[PDB]
Design a protein around this motif. Structure first.
Motif, PDB file in Angstrom:
ATOM      1  N   UNK A 541       0.831  -1.232   0.000  1.00  0.00           N
ATOM      2  CA  UNK A 541       0.000   0.000   0.000  1.00  0.00           C
ATOM      3  C   UNK A 541       0.849   1.260   0.000  1.00  0.00           C
ATOM      4  N   UNK A 542       1.892   1.274   0.839  1.00  0.00           N
ATOM      5  CA  UNK A 542       2.798   2.429   0.931  1.00  0.00           C
ATOM      6  C   UNK A 542       3.627   2.577  -0.333  1.00  0.00           C
ATOM      7  N   UNK A 543       4.143   1.466  -0.860  1.00  0.00           N
ATOM      8  CA  UNK A 543       4.955   1.530  -2.075  1.00  0.00           C
ATOM      9  C   UNK A 543       4.112   2.039  -3.252  1.00  0.00           C
ATOM     10  N   UNK A 545       1.459   4.020  -2.932  1.00  0.00           N
ATOM     11  CA  UNK A 545       1.224   5.442  -2.709  1.00  0.00           C
ATOM     12  C   UNK A 545       2.404   6.309  -3.112  1.00  0.00           C
ATOM     13  N   UNK A 546       3.618   5.827  -2.869  1.00  0.00           N
ATOM     14  CA  UNK A 546       4.796   6.581  -3.245  1.00  0.00           C
ATOM     15  C   UNK A 546       4.865   6.712  -4.773  1.00  0.00           C
TER      16      UNK A 546
END
Ligand SMILES: Nc1nc(O)c2nc(CNc3ccc(C(=O)O)cc3)cnc2n1
Ligand SMILES: Nc1nc(O)c2nc(CNc3ccc(C(=O)O)cc3)cnc2n1
Ligand SMILES: Nc1ncnc2c1ncn2[C@@H]1O[C@H](COP(=O)(O)O)[C@@H](O)[C@H]1O
Ligand SMILES: Nc1ncnc2c1ncn2[C@@H]1O[C@H](COP(=O)(O)O)[C@@H](O)[C@H]1O
Ligand SMILES: Nc1nc2c(c(=O)[nH]1)N=C(CO)CN2
Ligand SMILES: [Ca+2]
Ligand SMILES: [Ca+2]
Ligand SMILES: [Mg+2]
Ligand SMILES: [Mg+2]
Ligand SMILES: [Mg+2]
Lengths: 549, 549
Positions: A541-543, A545-546
């Motif tokens: 999810x974070x990757x 978003x980046x």
């Protein structure tokens, strides 16, 4: 006419078909229905390309379930289906080498006359489309056919289209024939005579005007990227007389032309698709989490289904269920069968779900009996066969129903959980595995399994030293053209990369797995088989978003 | 001879071969340039350079001969003389024989073509400097320089420029004892043979890569009358031509260094974990439980420990009764002892002058982490020079304080305003003789940034590719915004930080300030090993082998 178009003697010809639809949400169902009718009315499917989302090619020189109702109301083919596995196909080998087949019952033309006539059709069509919106979903198929000739095949093909009432089916090649026939006038009872040869008949009016000419190869073969794209998957080395080069060279020039004289980069909007269950997935666009459900200490059905639900909520898109451990040096509990561990849990999940976003279900099995029961009882979507269907290739018969096709993971290993750690010599590690998997796909594809439903797995930790498992990941780019499934989760090699004691190394290992998730994210690995779903989901999810700019 | 009292601008070169001690060497060199020549007002980075073709000092510091001049430790906003030097405005005439424009060209070229012969019968550690100098002539400088050279005992100090001048000359106690207050009679007999000539600019200045590299850091836009272009233009042509003609990426063997304590760190070569020790995390502080965590962290994989008593997390209420130094200094004191009872670098997260003074004096810390980029009390910069020893510094961007920052969120250009802000800050410390290679950049994630703005700062982290970069994402609210209850969110946050660790790893971020050391270390270990490729040719070599089989 009865002497040749409807002659007694049965031929074996090779045909190459192109399939199109404009329906995105139903593409799989439309196209796989076409495949079944092809398999039913034309002969044997012996090759398929990937499924593609393709940009419309109009100018060269620039929602309903009546299908399921059709599928219970079909006339029987006068020709028999044989589901037996085959290892080779003579007529197909002859097709590819371009070697000597029967003479064409339909009158041929030479290259010059083909080129003048093909060329003519294009200019007329270009100006028509000049004077006067949605993506295409395309697929090619090689059929080993019992249909006498290309015209008769086009008749049967037109029937298939009207039956399905959305679908477009073209003959690209038929043996080594060059054919241009300009003003086809087919009698209303000729069509019937042709159809009756191949079908036990219980629409014909529509077809009479629908066949005005016949071109072999199809007019647009060299002129549509989307066609060349599909053919490059199946028959890259093929050179028909009427073509300047092999399909691969033709595909390649076309890619580089769009780059060197138009600066387009043509691959960007002609996407390769794989299929996990029934929807489209774009190849290389998402790293899907596959949650592991290990069922073996005995795991109770109710708790196991609890664990399934937990995983769905933790963000798993696919649950891989297994009742037979492949972990190094294990032996199963003899008191309880693979099916007894596995089937109840899948039955309970189906009941507990139907009471209520539905996860795809994969079964980690190599055993025919287990998979047969699962498929009969609509319990699973995907076969995760860790022997790449070599343990019992009969399991391949279970991947086709009539209407329905099932997807399959093909994994590389040698030996069993006791022998594998010793079976570790490879001349060329990365390419030996890669070639093995391509060879396994070929065999599946020869036996009518659609290419776009086959997933590749390098089998990390299976007959691989730890450095070898690392090297396989370092060189994961080798699968850039293919749907890719990997399982690194909690394997010994992760620990080998690192620097209460028992619970400590346990943690470092899960934490190290998340590094491989990150790596998989950037390498665009399609599926990752993991124990720790929530942790993996958080990383991805974070990757993601980046990357959203 | 040696009379008048004036101020000049003097560019120096500083060299050494002793990789293990290049810091201890060049910073002693730097201080002696601070004592004996004037004031350091610019430095470049430290560089490991290829020469183009292929324990006693501690006591030497106690016994130094003092300058006639006074050391002015106080801060400056600008230097008028230096601004004149940079534009080549009106400076005084030379007290030495300066040659004309076209004569220097020919007189230099012979020293070059003679010198690539006498050599024609190890690693270089380079660092340039700009000095506001009380010396009146290049030669008296070279005199005190070769005195300094000899006074050490492995060190080459050159003069690269001296105001706008263009000098060539072919071929002492009176100079020394009027700048400095006097076995000291081994020196003068060496010097007389050692000093042979003087060229301003220095001979190799326009030919050696190692110099244009250093000069590009300090004075990019500077143009001498001699040189056919600006320093930037010469440097970029040297890079462009080594690529076009010789097919060499010239940067790869000429590495930028930053320094955390006393050793060399190659810019972009490692992502260091910085372990967070926040002493203020019910009512009693436990100075032994905090040293426990310092050790736990070292074992877990921390290169650096960041300690802070003052919290700057959102809306935090600072402990009303117990102070910052009582939270911090004894926790440090305990540490210093039990270690003396592989030594980690210690970072103090403070903006408070007295706290840092007390830590620096008692040898408790190596790095100042200043979350206000030294704007709370610019005087704190003075504590980064115990004139023998230097200390490094993190400069961070924020606006407001923990109660107001969340509101202070409009930027004209987010990415570049922050970069410009930190660059201006670096320029200030540098103009005041803080060595460039000891200044680290932090973008201050979550400090006056909306969640999307913290992400945008990361998306654009490449903007810091020239600079040593320290970041702190660990457990901040923005991670969570990207994704039996409330336990999840804690875990998700830590697990989502590991994504940022991985991203940081690939983006080559130099330092990451994290809570969860072990988890972070595990991720970094696995990513490192995946990148550890045995043969860089093998992927194409193996691919070719496979295609031939
Ligand atoms: N498609 C697929 N892909 C896998 O990678 C996999 N792994 C297991 C679990 N098997 C192993 C093998 C090796 C190791 C070790 O060395 O630690 C551990 C577990 C089970 N089904 C699997 N199915
Ligand atoms: N150099 C440096 N760099 C940091 O990033 C940092 N962060 C903190 C902790 N401060 C914060 C700020 C914002 C947030 C939130 O939004 O959650 C949390 C903690 C303390 N010292 C720091 N020092
Ligand atoms: N090889 C071929 N395959 C399919 N259709 C063909 C072929 N040669 C000619 N046609 C004609 O082209 C039309 C097919 O529809 P369309 O795809 O829209 O052109 C029909 O009139 C076909 O008879
Ligand atoms: N601009 C200059 N700076 C320093 N030394 C110089 C310069 N021009 C000439 N020299 C002399 O040339 C020698 C060069 O030494 P090196 O570069 O260490 O081989 C020194 O010993 C000086 O006496
Ligand atoms: N990409 C693509 N373009 C087309 C197609 C098709 O199948 N794919 N079929 C057409 C008419 O039969 C016209 N244009
Ligand atoms: Ca069939
Ligand atoms: Ca000074
Ligand atoms: Mg079409
Ligand atoms: Mg068509
Ligand atoms: Mg020199």
């Amino acid at each position: 006419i009865q002497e040749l178009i409807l002659s007694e003697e049965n031929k074996t010809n090779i045909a190459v078909l192109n399939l199109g639809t404009n329906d995105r949400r139903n593409a799989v169902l439309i196209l796989e229905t076409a495949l079944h009718l092809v398999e039913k009315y034309l002969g044997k499917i012996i090759n398929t390309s990937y499924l593609y989302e393709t940009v419309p090619e109009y100018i060269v020189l620039d929602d309903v379930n009546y299908i399921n109702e059709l599928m219970q109301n079909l006339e029987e083919s006068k020709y028999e289906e044989n589901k037996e596995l085959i290892d080779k196909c003579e007529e197909y080998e002859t097709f590819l080498k371009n070697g000597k087949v029967d003479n064409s019952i339909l009158k041929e033309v030479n290259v010059e006359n083909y080129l003048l006539e093909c060329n003519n059709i294009i200019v007329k069509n270009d100006e028509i489309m000049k004077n006067n919106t949605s993506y295409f979903y395309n697929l090619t198929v090689v059929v080993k056919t019992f249909v006498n000739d290309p015209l008769s095949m086009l008749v049967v093909i037109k029937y298939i289209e009207e039956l399905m009432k959305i679908i477009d089916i073209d003959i690209l090649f038929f043996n080594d024939f060059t054919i241009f026939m300009k003003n086809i006038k087919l009698e209303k009872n000729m069509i019937y005579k042709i159809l009756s040869k191949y079908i036990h008949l219980e629409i014909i009016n529509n077809m009479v005007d629908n066949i005005e000419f016949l071109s072999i190869p199809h007019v647009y073969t060299t002129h549509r990227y989307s066609i060349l794209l599909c053919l490059n998957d199946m028959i890259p080395e093929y050179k028909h007389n009427v073509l300047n080069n092999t399909i691969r060279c033709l595909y390649n020039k076309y890619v580089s032309r769009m780059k060197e004289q138009y600066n387009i980069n043509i691959k960007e909007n002609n996407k390769r698709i794989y299929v996990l269950k029934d929807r489209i997935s774009y190849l290389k666009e998402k790293t899907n989490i596959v949650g592991i459900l290990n069922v073996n200490i005995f795991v109770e059905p109710k708790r196991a289904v609890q664990r399934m639900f937990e995983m769905i909520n933790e963000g798993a898109s696919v649950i891989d269920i297994g009742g037979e451990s492949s972990a190094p040096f294990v032996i199963p509990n003899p008191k309880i069968s693979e099916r007894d561990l596995v089937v109840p849990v899948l039955q309970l999940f189906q009941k507990e779900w139907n009471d209520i976003a539905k996860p795809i279900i994969s079964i980690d099995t190599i055993n025919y009996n287990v998979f047969k029961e699962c498929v009969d009882n609509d319990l699973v979507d995907i076969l995760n066969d860790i022997s790449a269907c070599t343990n019992n290739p009969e399991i391949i018969k279970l991947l086709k129903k009539k209407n329905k096709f099932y997807s399959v993971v093909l994994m590389h290993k040698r030996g069993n959980p006791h022998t594998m750690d010793k079976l570790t010599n490879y001349d060329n590690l990365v390419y030996d595995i890669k070639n093995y998997l391509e060879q396994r796909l070929n065999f599946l594809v020869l036996n009518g399994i659609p290419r776009y439903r086959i997933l590749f797995d390098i089998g990390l930790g299976f007959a691989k030293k730890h450095d070898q498992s690392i090297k396989l990941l370092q060189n994961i780019h080798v699968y850039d053209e293919y749907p890719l499934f990997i399982g690194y989760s909690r394997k010994r090699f992760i620990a080998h990369c690192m620097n209460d004691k028992d619970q400590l190394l346990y943690q470092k290992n899960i934490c190290g797995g998340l590094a491989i998730a990150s790596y998989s994210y950037y390498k665009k690995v399609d599926l990752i088989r993991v124990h720790d779903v929530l942790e993996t989901k958080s990383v991805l999810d974070v990757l993601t978003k980046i990357d959203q700019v």
